[PDB]
Design a protein around this ligand. Sequence first.
Ligand SMILES: [Zn+2]
Ligand SMILES: [Zn+2]
Lengths: 9, 77
Amino acid sequence: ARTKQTARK
Amino acid sequence: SPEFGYWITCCPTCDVDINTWVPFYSTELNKPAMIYCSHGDGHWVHAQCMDLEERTLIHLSEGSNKYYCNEHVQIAR
Ligand SMILES: [Zn+2]
Ligand SMILES: [Zn+2]
């Protein structure tokens, strides 16, 4: 699913 | 558009507010995590407002599975 702000920092 | 789209009222019980929001998920810093609901023409919702645990959200983000928000998840497809 498309998401936002789910990338690890 | 950097923040446009993030500060919407995603559902009737949406708790995300530009005037009160704070990070919840480990992947958040200054903006709420969001996930696309594939119902109808589709729409964006805040993951926290869906009571999605972090691993569930991350797994969804790492795959091709479509997501349906709590309001539309029970609708005949
Ligand atoms: Zn919301
Ligand atoms: Zn939906």
